[PDB]
Design an enzyme around this catalytic site. Structure first.
Site, PDB file in Angstrom:
ATOM      1  N   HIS A 187      86.269 -42.705 102.837  1.00 52.39           N
ATOM      2  CA  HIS A 187      85.743 -41.656 101.992  1.00 52.39           C
ATOM      3  C   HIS A 187      84.508 -41.043 102.649  1.00 52.39           C
ATOM      4  CE1 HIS A 187      84.732 -40.341  97.670  1.00 52.39           C
ATOM      5  NE2 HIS A 187      84.666 -39.345  98.538  1.00 52.39           N
ATOM      6  N   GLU A 192      81.604 -33.695 103.214  1.00 54.57           N
ATOM      7  CA  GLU A 192      80.971 -34.948 103.589  1.00 54.57           C
ATOM      8  C   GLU A 192      79.800 -34.668 104.505  1.00 54.57           C
ATOM      9  OE1 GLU A 192      81.528 -38.135 102.400  1.00 54.57           O
ATOM     10  OE2 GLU A 192      82.744 -37.021 100.946  1.00 54.57           O
ATOM     11  N   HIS A 201      76.237 -35.516 102.947  1.00 51.05           N
ATOM     12  CA  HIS A 201      75.796 -36.827 103.380  1.00 51.05           C
ATOM     13  C   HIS A 201      75.302 -36.856 104.813  1.00 51.05           C
ATOM     14  CE1 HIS A 201      77.386 -38.329  99.661  1.00 51.05           C
ATOM     15  NE2 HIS A 201      78.589 -37.851  99.948  1.00 51.05           N
TER      16      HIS A 201
END
Ligand SMILES: *[C@@H]1O[C@H](CO)[C@@H](O)[C@H](O)[C@H]1NC(C)=O
Ligand SMILES: *[C@@H]1O[C@H](CO)[C@@H](O)[C@H](O)[C@H]1NC(C)=O
Length: 196
Positions: free
Chosen positions: A32, A81, A85
């Site tokens: 993930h 992502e 992040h």
């Protein structure tokens, strides 16, 4: 932020539509993401650039497929992502470029080898329920740290969806840690579904 969280998920659980990577969900845990714990969205001026990770694309398709929204453009997920992040994770020198962040993420997924770990432990997708302690205790023994294990609730019994392992900020070594419906799994029976 203080630590990283390597987040892996079970496609048959998390898949939402029978399309693309979820048409036949991979029969293995996939990435993930690699998430700084306490910071997100750190640099709106540093957009995802697919070209920078071109070399990693075969591994990203195999191990980091889009099994949540399953958009046809798989790079929408990786962009998410990166922007959410990776821009924060880039404070760390080992993760300080798109290529280094995504490449390190893939390396960590290989080194952790959660898929082989579970299978060696005899924990395989099954019609028969497991107990959440089967996963927690066995992963704690193998990795030496307590994972977070997250489930979809019954919509029957909860279904395991996501396993999180915390990693040190600088060298991404295993450490202890202390959603689209995923919540901490309750102690007790849990379904670990064979893919469709
Ligand atoms: C945002 O990213 C750009 C591109 O790497 C970099 O030049 C800049 O210093 C970053 N800004 C912050 C606050 O990190
Ligand atoms: C994490 O905590 C567990 C459970 O208390 C402990 O047994 C283990 O040694 C710890 N691992 C690390 C790397 O600190």
């Amino acid at each position: 932020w203080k630590k990283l969280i390597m987040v892996q998920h079970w496609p048959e659980t998390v898949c939402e539509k029978i399309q693309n990577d979820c048409r036949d969900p991979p029969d293995y845990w996939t990435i993930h993401g690699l998430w700084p714990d306490k910071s997100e969205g750190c640099n709106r001026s540093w957009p995802f650039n697919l070209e920078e990770i071109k070399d990693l694309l075969p591994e990203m398709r195999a191990y980091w497929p889009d099994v949540i929204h399953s958009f046809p453009n798989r790079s929408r997920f990786w962009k998410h992502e990166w922007e959410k992040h990776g821009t924060c994770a880039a404070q760390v020198d080992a993760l300080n470029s798109q290529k280094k962040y995504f490449g390190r993420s893939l390396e960590l997924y290989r080194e952790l080898d959660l898929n082989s770990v579970l299978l060696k432990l005899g924990i395989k997708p099954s019609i028969n329920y497991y107990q959440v302690a089967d996963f927690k205790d066995a992963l704690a023994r193998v990795y030496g740290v307590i994972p977070k294990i997250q489930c979809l609730p019954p919509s029957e019994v909860q279904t395991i969806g996501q396993i999180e392992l915390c990693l040190t900020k600088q060298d991404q070594q295993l450490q202890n840690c202390t959603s689209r419906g995923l919540r901490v799994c309750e102690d007790g029976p849990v379904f670990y579904p064979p893919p469709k």
